[PDB]
Amino acid sequence: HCDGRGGLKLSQDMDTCEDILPCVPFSVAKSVKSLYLGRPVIRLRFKRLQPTRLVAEFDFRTFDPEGILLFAGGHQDSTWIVLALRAGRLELQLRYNGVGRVTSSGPVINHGMWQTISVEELARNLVIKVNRDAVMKIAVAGDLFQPERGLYHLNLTVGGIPFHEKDLVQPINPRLDGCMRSWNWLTVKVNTRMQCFSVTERGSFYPGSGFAFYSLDYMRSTWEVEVVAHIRPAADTGVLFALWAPDLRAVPLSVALVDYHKKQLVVLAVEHTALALMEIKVCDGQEHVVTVSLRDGEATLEVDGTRGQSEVSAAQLQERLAVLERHLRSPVLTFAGGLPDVPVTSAPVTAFYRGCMTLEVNRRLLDLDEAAYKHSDITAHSCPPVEPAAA
Template sequence: MYFPSLFLLLCVSLAQLSQEAVNGHGVKNKHTSGKGLLNLGFKSPLMHTKANLSDITNIKSSFEFRTLDPEGVLLYGDTQGGVEWFVLALRGGLPEMQIGKGDAIAIVTGGPRLNDGRWHQVQLRSEGRLVVLEVGGAPVLMVGLHSQHAVEHTMGQIRLSLGGLLVQELELFRPIQPQMDGCIRAGNWLNHNLTWETDLGEKGRLCLAEIQRGSFFPGTGLAAFNTSDFPVHQTNSSFITIEMEGPLAEWSGTALIILSSQYDPVLTITAQNRSKELKVLFHEHAVSVSEPLAKLSLSLSRYMVKIDLDNRIIRELYDDTHDWLARWHEGMVLAFGGVPENTNDIAADNGSGYLHGCVRQIRIQGREVDLDHALYKHSSVSSHSCPTSVGLLDP
């Protein structure tokens, strides 16, 4: 079967076009102090910097941080080009620190839950062989590591990055999803006047004054999965459920599309906020719903799709030309927020077919879908946060 290669090619093409869209502004690298308001979610890593160890007199950094994302990297640092390293991240909403030194790795997780959408004052400092994490002025975590084979270095360089890892092949004690949908401000890094480097140009993602839970699609990109990543046989079910929570009446654009391995549309859902209309197209059948409410649910069986709005059955559509459950198992493209159909259309980046709106929650077989685990996600899509008033951000 050639589909996995086809899907991989699709994701690589989308990623290249996304990067070209960023670089198309004519800005290769931008330098900043790292003290202002920064959104970590646009790129991984967002920024990076380096300094001579001989110039650093105090290993202490502080910043304010806000997120609704339960998992991702905040700060990474290393010396000797990654031989010795440190990571501050969130896992399950809790702070986690990992240290690698020589042949040893240490990890500690705990403290207060930080993915509550509020601003938190965070400080990291080194006390000899210990690293201490403070939140709100109170110590919450401490980790230490000593290796008999490690050598203390006061020469060379120290590297830092925000929102991602600088060493791709870094093997953490517990692997973690690096992308972080969050914001940092008031950064003070190593008590040193560091210059950070980023290639985002002037069009990075904004840090909003107020946020709410959900995934925000600004009308410029999509997130794509392989349906085989959601195995149905594990639930002993004869149908597949896909649920999306609104407000559906505020959506505009393509909310969902399923494409076969031959790249033919199987099911498409589009919305229009001006007419308050939702359209579902399944093979050759079409359904239009006016005044859609808060929750859309699709049940896809072998030859039928059932459409529910707020737990009320709207329509049942039949098509016995294909076994859609078998095709789901084999692998199809499941895309939220747009149509990955024609790369030329995507390169135009006019956003005409992309979704603009907040999706409060996406569930497949009752399990919440995290867009950070998509095989491809456009950098403009926020996985875990929406503006409280989407109408203020109309494209």
């Protein structure tokens, strides 16, 4: 037993522990002149003498279906607008003198391609454009700028709002894994961490240093566990999915990549017992579909449609599943990409996963922005591409 959580794995004749190194490199290219909205990322204030109307333009890119791009206006009880995304479509929320309205049009925006977005306040209406084409026009009577002393002021936040989401016209989860560039108001501060991947692909990226967890119920067979994971690994060892029983320091169920049977494998387990193993080309840079389904008297593991062989007898399989039932009988936590500090004998693998991954549990796609907790370095709705060879 080595410490996977520590970046070590058993090597060769099981005489020593070795470092878990990446077998597939992912591009690290960052876009210097860009802003990552993940993790308000920026608050601006425009003290303007002489009446004036709001005008703003910027480039935007994302695969994320929901979130807030920006806010503009004054006090939560005054007049303001919020540009957001819901179900992948642009949404404009407005509040003029306390009165709130909300509209959204057919422009699907979360396609991952850069696009120019513009917002302009005309004495008559508010106009929103996508690539020069007007997509929203709402009649309004009021002003976004507000008189203070002898000047006109206006606050603008990027990537979030100055108040709580519960005070919006329509509630929304603000977290937005998206990128901005070429800002033109009427913020270039070099901090690598604030820059976005130069190129993006679909999925969630796990650098291999943390996890995310949820509180999901698997009761009602009287119970059921179904998982579908689309993965593009960077390393041959790591936890993909797992359940944790806190008061027992146990890991009732886990699905992970393991390089020893020495073979590149995916393992399905209940606590320390491997129920099934299935081969997989974990280092060829390709995407693979791993699926698992368990119910009373049944457990199945598949990799790209092919079922793996059972590692236990029919009798002991029923014994293991019986114990699983007892566990699911009490509240457990669901982990993605890693585990908390648990006994090394608790499960076959405890190392953190490294690579791109999408998870669907009990037929429901998991959105990392909805997790009770998500380690800050995990990108919820984007993954860098595998790095191309020189040629």
